[PDB]
């Protein structure tokens, strides 16, 4: 019983620009997703200062990138706080509205694509290299859910009963575009992380 909702209009507009831009420095997506994964991890680490049993669903704090060449899929996983079904809907489909609006405003006032992470909406940069994402997430406060988008006006949310179980946190499963298959190669991934995410405070496992 998957459910379908429309994005706020500003989010759909931003996804439209991002998925069509020929901006040539596309590898900044991975930086943005690693920085989101690092924030999700800070969140669970913060919560567990007053509440150490929140860690027990997955005591390991990490980020892990797994290419799946046979599906043209790149997955980025973190063991951060995760999102509940209501957080998937709200956070990805609704309250990004003012960030994506401010960023579109910045783009008409002299900013470029690589500044997207300054506006709190770097998540959407994944459309530079993917035409579709599944966000699989497990918060301590809910079941595991899949949020899915193809950069159009709607997304779906589905109770996850298909994927490997996550103790906690989130996997971004990117369905890479035909011309962006380089991001399947371990070597290419290492160069991008060394280039942009050297300073990240969690291990990045590949």
């Amino acid at each position: 019983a998957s459910e379908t909702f429309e994005f706020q209009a500003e989010i759909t507009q931003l996804m439209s620009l991002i998925i069509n831009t020929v901006y040539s420095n596309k590898e900044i997506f991975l930086r943005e997703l690693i920085s989101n994964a690092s924030d999700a991890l800070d969140k669970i680490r913060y919560k567990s200062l007053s509440d150490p049993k929140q860690l027990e669903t997955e005591p390991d704090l990490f980020i892990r990138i797994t290419p799946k060449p046979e599906q043209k899929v790149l997955e980025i996983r973190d063991s951060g706080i995760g999102m509940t079904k209501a957080e998937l809907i709200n956070n990805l489909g609704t309250i990004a509205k003012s960030g994506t609006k401010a960023f579109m405003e910045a783009l008409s006032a002299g900013a470029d694509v690589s500044m997207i992470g300054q506006f709190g909406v770097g998540f959407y940069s994944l459309f530079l290299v993917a035409d579709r994402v599944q966000v699989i997430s497990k918060s301590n406060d809910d079941e595991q859910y899949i949020w899915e988008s193809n950069a159009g006006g709607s997304f779906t949310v589905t109770l996850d009963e298909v994927n490997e179980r996550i103790g906690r946190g989130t996997i971004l499963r990117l369905f890479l575009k035909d011309d962006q298959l380089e991001y399947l190669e371990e070597k290419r991934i290492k160069e991008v992380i060394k280039r942009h995410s050297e300073f990240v405070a969690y291990p990045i496992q590949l």
Binding site: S98, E105, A106, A109, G110, A111, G117, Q118, F199
Partner: protein, 193 residues
């Protein structure tokens, strides 16, 4: 003042659009000439323009970087030192600031955004007032009088409404005075001058 801005406009604007502390630090480091009163002042003016253009969401992003620059200049005056040589320690202090510090940082950002909105509202009201000056010009009568004003200046009676008004010829030369103003404001058209 004048051509500092002309040289560096894009770079000031770019700094205005950043947000992450490491990026803001790095960018000022590569362009330490940006760290000065003139960039603070131009960012303040750019926030007012954005808010007047109805780019409210971007104004908030720029306001944050404005307060950051203002805080750099403040801390520099505290320490007796040059802002270009001490800005890095603002960023060092902000990245691990106490909760209470970030709360006052946020109150000063919000107060700043309110002053920017009060300033934009002045520019908007200036334009509305000009617009209404022209609505006024456009309804002036043939002798340059506004028939709204003249209406209200008239003795009570007069016609939300003809030969009745005529029978009301009872009053000295005061009658010439209001009648003339009715002609000049277009309230009355002399059918035969």
């Amino acid at each position: 003042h004048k051509t500092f801005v002309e040289k560096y406009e894009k770079q000031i604007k770019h700094f205005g659009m950043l947000r992450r502390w490491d990026d803001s630090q790095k960018y000022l480091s590569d362009n330490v000439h940006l760290v000065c009163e003139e960039t603070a002042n131009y960012l303040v003016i750019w926030c007012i323009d954005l808010e007047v253009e109805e780019k409210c969401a971007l104004m908030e992003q720029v306001a944050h970087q404005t307060i950051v620059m203002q805080f750099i200049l403040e801390l520099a005056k505290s320490l007796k030192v040059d802002p270009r040589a001490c800005f890095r320690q603002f960023f060092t202090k902000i990245k691990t600031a106490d909760r209470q510090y970030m709360e006052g940082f946020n109150d000063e950002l919000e107060a700043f955004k309110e002053r920017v909105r009060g300033r934009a509202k002045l520019r908007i009201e200036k334009a509305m007032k000009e617009y209404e000056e022209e609505e006024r010009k456009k309804r002036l009568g043939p002798g340059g009088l506004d028939p709204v004003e003249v209406y209200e200046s008239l003795p009570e009676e007069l016609q939300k409404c003809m030969l009745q008004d005529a029978i009301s010829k009872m009053d000295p030369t005061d009658a010439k005075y209001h009648m003339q103003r009715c002609i000049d404001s277009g309230l009355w058209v002399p059918n035969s001058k």
